[PDB]
Design an enzyme around this catalytic site. Structure first.
Site, PDB file in Angstrom:
ATOM      1  N   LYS A  33      19.058  44.424  33.146  1.00  0.00           N
ATOM      2  CA  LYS A  33      18.794  45.737  32.592  1.00  0.00           C
ATOM      3  C   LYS A  33      20.108  46.245  32.011  1.00  0.00           C
ATOM      4  O   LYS A  33      21.139  46.249  32.680  1.00  0.00           O
ATOM      5  CB  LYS A  33      18.279  46.695  33.649  1.00  0.00           C
ATOM      6  CG  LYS A  33      18.034  48.111  33.103  1.00  0.00           C
ATOM      7  CD  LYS A  33      16.746  48.184  32.286  1.00  0.00           C
ATOM      8  CE  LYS A  33      16.656  49.446  31.409  1.00  0.00           C
ATOM      9  NZ  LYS A  33      17.401  49.263  30.133  1.00  0.00           N
ATOM     10  N   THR A  34      20.066  46.691  30.764  1.00  0.00           N
ATOM     11  CA  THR A  34      21.252  47.258  30.141  1.00  0.00           C
ATOM     12  C   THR A  34      21.231  48.775  30.103  1.00  0.00           C
ATOM     13  O   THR A  34      20.218  49.417  30.423  1.00  0.00           O
ATOM     14  CB  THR A  34      21.526  46.679  28.728  1.00  0.00           C
ATOM     15  OG1 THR A  34      20.384  46.892  27.902  1.00  0.00           O
ATOM     16  CG2 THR A  34      21.814  45.170  28.789  1.00  0.00           C
ATOM     17  N   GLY A  35      22.368  49.347  29.713  1.00  0.00           N
ATOM     18  CA  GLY A  35      22.465  50.789  29.515  1.00  0.00           C
ATOM     19  C   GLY A  35      23.511  51.106  28.481  1.00  0.00           C
ATOM     20  O   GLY A  35      24.444  50.347  28.278  1.00  0.00           O
ATOM     21  N   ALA A  36      23.337  52.248  27.831  1.00  0.00           N
ATOM     22  CA  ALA A  36      24.277  52.716  26.816  1.00  0.00           C
ATOM     23  C   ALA A  36      24.341  54.232  26.903  1.00  0.00           C
ATOM     24  O   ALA A  36      23.326  54.898  27.115  1.00  0.00           O
ATOM     25  CB  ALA A  36      23.844  52.289  25.400  1.00  0.00           C
TER      26      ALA A  36
ATOM     27  N   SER B  74      21.062  53.559  31.608  1.00  0.00           N
ATOM     28  CA  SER B  74      19.697  53.101  31.826  1.00  0.00           C
ATOM     29  C   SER B  74      19.600  52.025  32.892  1.00  0.00           C
ATOM     30  O   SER B  74      18.495  51.645  33.279  1.00  0.00           O
ATOM     31  CB  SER B  74      19.067  52.606  30.531  1.00  0.00           C
ATOM     32  OG  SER B  74      18.756  53.691  29.671  1.00  0.00           O
TER      33      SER B  74
ATOM     34  N   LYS C 191      17.245  52.642  35.843  1.00  0.00           N
ATOM     35  CA  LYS C 191      15.797  52.424  35.769  1.00  0.00           C
ATOM     36  C   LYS C 191      15.309  51.333  36.723  1.00  0.00           C
ATOM     37  O   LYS C 191      14.163  51.381  37.168  1.00  0.00           O
ATOM     38  CB  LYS C 191      15.365  52.183  34.314  1.00  0.00           C
ATOM     39  CG  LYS C 191      15.489  53.462  33.459  1.00  0.00           C
ATOM     40  CD  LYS C 191      15.572  53.202  31.989  1.00  0.00           C
ATOM     41  CE  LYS C 191      15.712  54.522  31.208  1.00  0.00           C
ATOM     42  NZ  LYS C 191      16.086  54.340  29.768  1.00  0.00           N
TER      43      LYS C 191
HETATM   44  B1  LIG Z   1      19.746  54.599  29.003  1.00  0.00           B
HETATM   45  O1  LIG Z   1      19.971  55.726  30.027  1.00  0.00           O
HETATM   46  O2  LIG Z   1      20.987  53.736  28.711  1.00  0.00           O
HETATM   47  C1  LIG Z   1      19.064  55.141  27.634  1.00  0.00           C
HETATM   48  N1  LIG Z   1      20.192  55.604  26.826  1.00  0.00           N
HETATM   49  C2  LIG Z   1      19.963  56.511  25.871  1.00  0.00           C
HETATM   50  O3  LIG Z   1      18.854  56.983  25.649  1.00  0.00           O
HETATM   51  C3  LIG Z   1      21.155  56.977  25.077  1.00  0.00           C
HETATM   52  C4  LIG Z   1      21.294  56.107  23.829  1.00  0.00           C
HETATM   53  C5  LIG Z   1      22.435  56.659  23.003  1.00  0.00           C
HETATM   54  C6  LIG Z   1      23.752  56.249  23.261  1.00  0.00           C
HETATM   55  C7  LIG Z   1      24.806  56.775  22.506  1.00  0.00           C
HETATM   56  C8  LIG Z   1      24.535  57.721  21.515  1.00  0.00           C
HETATM   57  O4  LIG Z   1      25.553  58.242  20.775  1.00  0.00           O
HETATM   58  C9  LIG Z   1      23.224  58.136  21.262  1.00  0.00           C
HETATM   59  C10 LIG Z   1      22.167  57.604  22.003  1.00  0.00           C
HETATM   60  N2  LIG Z   1      20.927  58.398  24.759  1.00  0.00           N
HETATM   61  C11 LIG Z   1      22.005  59.205  24.735  1.00  0.00           C
HETATM   62  O5  LIG Z   1      23.086  58.836  25.183  1.00  0.00           O
HETATM   63  N3  LIG Z   1      21.924  60.547  24.138  1.00  0.00           N
HETATM   64  C12 LIG Z   1      22.555  61.561  24.995  1.00  0.00           C
HETATM   65  C13 LIG Z   1      22.005  62.988  24.848  1.00  0.00           C
HETATM   66  N4  LIG Z   1      21.569  63.305  23.489  1.00  0.00           N
HETATM   67  C14 LIG Z   1      21.115  64.695  23.447  1.00  0.00           C
HETATM   68  C15 LIG Z   1      21.631  65.377  22.196  1.00  0.00           C
HETATM   69  C16 LIG Z   1      20.501  62.383  23.113  1.00  0.00           C
HETATM   70  O6  LIG Z   1      19.528  62.733  22.462  1.00  0.00           O
HETATM   71  C17 LIG Z   1      20.637  60.958  23.557  1.00  0.00           C
HETATM   72  O7  LIG Z   1      19.684  60.208  23.404  1.00  0.00           O
END
Ligand SMILES: *[B]([O])([O])[C][N]C(=O)[C]([C]C1=[C][C]=C([O])[C]=[C]1)[N]C(=O)N1[C][C]N([C][C])C(=O)C1=O
Ligand SMILES: OC[C@H]1O[C@H](O[C@H]2[C@H](O)[C@@H](O)[C@H](OCCCCCCC3CCCCC3)O[C@@H]2CO)[C@H](O)[C@@H](O)[C@@H]1O
Length: 265
Positions: free
Chosen positions: A209-212, A45, A48
């Site tokens: 801004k963080t991301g995961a 993220s 963004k």
């Molecule tokens: B940003 O791009 O950092 C926003 N990040 C997300 O929305 C991540 C959050 C997240 C991290 C790790 C895990 O295990 C779940 C959620 N979203 C994400 O990585 N995943 C990847 C794809 N997957 C589809 C099945 C999601 O629904 C999802 O949100």
């Protein structure tokens, strides 16, 4: 705490993961600490901020307005959309969408804005226009977070991201008002900003801004400095670690602590 580079190494050893880090003077672009700065890491993220740089460039050119209201639909939504879910009836302005994308990490807001700049390919073209020949966006939210081992999709390098952020915030590629807007959105981060302030000593400025993502992917792009000044860009990415979110947060915080205790370099 250890010296910055020593702490970064310790973090890798404890995480059994790769860390990538740059510390850069915001005013001059001088690189101060660098670790795996030319290696690729998923942006997650953190993209963004670059996205909204591209939006602001359209605003500056008269091709977009932050006031313009977009009336989107429920079929446009993806997960983790706490702001955009509230506005199916009434819509959101382009500026509200950028605020939600940056300060709340709202994924549907990001996807709506991404379409306005030509999708992943369009944002990648914008990056090339500002002289970033490395960073690439290939996918939309939320697939762009997949962080497959060895996958170059949706990646940056610490060096490229830091240079790109400096260009957006300070190089006058954006108007003065737009530079100020992009900075304020980072100052207003609600995901990590308040938590970071709660553990920073008095006097330290933060905007971020963080991301995961998956497979341990986690990162932050930030402005940090003493005397209440945005003195340095600090970019930290983690990848390919099995560690808990809590430990990943702590390790990034530990690198921050090492910077804070050893700032004069
Ligand atoms: B940003 O791009 O950092 C926003 N990040 C997300 O929305 C991540 C959050 C997240 C991290 C790790 C895990 O295990 C779940 C959620 N979203 C994400 O990585 N995943 C990847 C794809 N997957 C589809 C099945 C999601 O629904 C999802 O949100
Ligand atoms: O002597 C230096 C300082 O030492 C401690 O400060 C600690 C603080 O108590 C702790 O909470 C923080 O953790 C680090 C928190 C970092 C926050 C996230 C950093 C981000 C910012 C930029 C992007 C990368 C990570 O470390 C500092 C330095 O030891 C004392 O509490 C403080 O009085 C003193 O001024």
């Amino acid at each position: 705490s250890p010296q910055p580079l020593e702490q970064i190494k310790l973090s890798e050893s404890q995480l059994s993961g790769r860390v990538g880090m740059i510390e850069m003077d915001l005013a001059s672009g001088r690189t101060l600490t660098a670790w795996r700065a030319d290696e690729r890491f998923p942006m997650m993220s953190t993209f963004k901020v670059v996205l909204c740089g591209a939006v602001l460039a359209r605003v500056d050119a008269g091709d977009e307005q932050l006031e313009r209201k977009i009336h989107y639909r429920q079929q446009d939504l993806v997960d983790y959309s706490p702001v955009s879910e509230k506005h199916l009836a009434d819509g959101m302005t382009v500026g509200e969408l950028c605020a939600a994308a940056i300060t709340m990490s709202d994924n549907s807001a990001a996807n709506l804005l991404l379409a306005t700049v030509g999708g992943p390919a369009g944002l990648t073209a914008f990056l090339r226009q500002i002289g970033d020949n490395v960073t690439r966006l290939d996918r939309w939210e939320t697939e762009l977070n997949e962080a497959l081992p060895g996958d170059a999709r949706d990646t940056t390098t610490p060096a490229s991201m830091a240079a790109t952020l400096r260009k957006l915030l300070t190089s006058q590629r954006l108007s003065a008002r737009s530079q100020r807007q992009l900075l304020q959105w980072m100052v207003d981060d609600r995901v990590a900003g308040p938590l970071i302030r709660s553990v920073l000593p008095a006097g330290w400025f933060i905007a971020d801004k963080t991301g995961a993502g998956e497979r341990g992917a986690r990162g932050i792009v930030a402005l940090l400095g003493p005397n209440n000044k945005a003195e340095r860009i600090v970019v930290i990415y983690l990848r390919d670690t099995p560690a808990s979110m809590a430990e990943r947060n702590q390790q990034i915080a530990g690198i921050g602590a090492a910077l804070i205790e050893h700032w004069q370099r």
